[PDB]
Antibody, heavy 220, light 213 residues
Framework: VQLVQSGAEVKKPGATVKISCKSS????????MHWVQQAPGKGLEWMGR????????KYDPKFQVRVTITADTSTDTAYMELSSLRSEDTAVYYC??????????????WGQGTLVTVSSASTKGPSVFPLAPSSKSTSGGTAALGCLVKDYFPEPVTVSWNSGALTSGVHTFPAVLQSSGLYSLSSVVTVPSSSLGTQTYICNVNHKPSNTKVDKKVEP | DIVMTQSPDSLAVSLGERATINCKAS??????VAWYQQKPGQPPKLLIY???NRYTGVPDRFSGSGSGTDFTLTISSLQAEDVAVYYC?????????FGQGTKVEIKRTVAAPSVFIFPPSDEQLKSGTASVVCLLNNFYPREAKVQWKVDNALQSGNSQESVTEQDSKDSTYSLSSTLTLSKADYEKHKVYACEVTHQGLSSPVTKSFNRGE
């Protein structure tokens, strides 16, 4: 039994999207399908349900106007369509369902999530700049280094250090959207300062959407 | 159009303590309520349905109660894997509204951050903008204040923050603030300092550099 949703999308404002969600393992037409929205770092919010047997939908007023949910029993997949896209529609969209509850419309089964981003921004790889302290003396025996990963779009990026060799003490921060319309984050790592720069700390950044692997040797 | 208000908004309990979230419905809702658990990245999980029925597989720690307008979820003895956001949901009527969620987090001894400051790379100054970066890593609790000052002048609209999820081993948080300004502004001014205020600090810690050193 699984719900598999369609892939992340990047959409201009005023466009329309149709996310799908396909069901293996059970009879779609015997149960309800619900879609739910989760705005970046906000709560879940119920959009609407559909009865695949009937075609009968109910919505939340918030969402009635601009969202249409439909279901195709021939492919056992349920679709969700927002029209008139808008930056605030950027959120993860979930199909969900209940069929082993045995007493209620509570949802025991959910999809991966499907990320919709609405932006006028164009696809663009990141520029990478090293974060090291001024000098040098420095700490001890403890210093922080890092990587400013700035001006890229869309998400996501993969940061790593020393091609994976270094994982302890490393924190890569939740990306942040700037007024550019572009994303900027940074990755940092705590290290022992006596060991610096005996060891080099390279920092590998990967932005698949713009085919971009880049690399910074970081040094104070 | 039924509104599910849950409280607290954030709960911090020691490993093995009890955890009480509860939920208030705007309108009598009978037994028709579920709770869910969500973790970063993952889709949600159903824990209780019909106000007090464990979905099979969910362990005994979790139990729900109440009927009508006042409902509660209990976690007998919190464990490492129970850190998540906890949501309340009504299936009584027309729009099946969720609550806003309660963040449940491991209580830890207090710890102040270690503050570090980074000047901009010459590599970036070529493009004509300067990002100064202040990093407070490994602190608890999350509540932290951070002010930028350029030559003693409180900066206001020109910086942005980001915060990690609580750490698996440490149970701690790290935060970075980034001050953006132009190459001109950066080259005219001289002292760049971030100043950090936090429970574990007995009074604010300033980290600062002067451009020309």
């Amino acid at each position: 039994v699984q719900l598999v949703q369609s892939g992340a999308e990047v959409k201009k404002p005023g466009a329309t999207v149709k996310i799908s969600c396909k069901s293996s393992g059970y009879n779609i037409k015997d149960v309800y399908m619900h879609w739910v929205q989760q705005a970046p770092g906000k709560g879940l919010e119920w959009m609407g349900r559909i009865d695949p047997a009937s075609g009968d939908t109910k919505y939340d007023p918030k969402f009635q106007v601009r969202v249409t949910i439909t279901a195709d029993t021939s492919t056992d997949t349920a679709y969700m369509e927002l029209s008139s896209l808008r930056s605030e529609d950027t959120a993860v969209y979930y199909c969900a369902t209940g069929m082993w509850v045995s007493t209620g419309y509570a949802l025991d089964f959910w999809g991966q999530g499907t990320l919709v981003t609405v932006s006028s921004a164009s696809t663009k790889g990141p520029s990478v700049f090293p974060l090291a302290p001024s000098s040098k003396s420095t700490s001890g025996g403890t210093a922080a280094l890092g990587c400013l990963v700035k001006d890229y779009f869309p998400e996501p990026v993969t940061v790593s250090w020393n091609s994976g060799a270094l994982t302890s003490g490393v924190h890569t921060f939740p990306a942040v959207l700037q007024s550019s319309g572009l994303y900027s984050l940074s990755s940092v790592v705590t290290v022992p300062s006596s060991s610096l720069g005996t060891q080099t700390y390279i920092c590998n950044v990967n932005h698949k959407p713009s085919n971009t692997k880049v690399d910074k040797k970081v040094e104070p | 159009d039924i509104v599910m208000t849950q409280s607290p908004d954030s709960l911090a309990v020691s490993l093995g303590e009890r955890a009480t979230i509860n939920c208030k419905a705007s309108q009598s809702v009978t037994n028709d309520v579920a709770w869910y658990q969500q973790k970063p990245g993952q889709p949600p999980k159903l824990l209780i349905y019909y106000a007090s029925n464990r979905y099979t597989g969910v362990p005994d720690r979790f139990s729900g109660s109440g009927s009508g307008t006042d409902f509660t979820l209990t976690i007998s003895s919190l464990q490492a894997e129970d850190v998540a956001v906890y949501y309340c949901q009504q299936d009584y009527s027309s729009p099946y509204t969720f609550g806003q969620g309660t963040k449940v987090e491991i209580k830890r001894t207090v710890a102040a951050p270690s503050v570090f400051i980074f000047p901009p790379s010459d590599e970036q100054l070529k493009s004509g903008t300067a990002s100064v970066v202040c990093l407070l890593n490994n602190f608890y609790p999350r509540e932290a204040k951070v002010q930028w000052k350029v030559d003693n002048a409180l900066q206001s609209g020109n910086s942005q923050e980001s915060v990690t999820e609580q750490d698996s081993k440490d149970s701690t948080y790290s935060l970075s603030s980034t001050l953006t300004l132009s190459k001109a502004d950066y080259e005219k001014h001289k002292v760049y300092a971030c100043e950090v205020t936090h429970q574990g600090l007995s009074s604010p810690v300033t980290k600062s550099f002067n451009r020309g050193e």
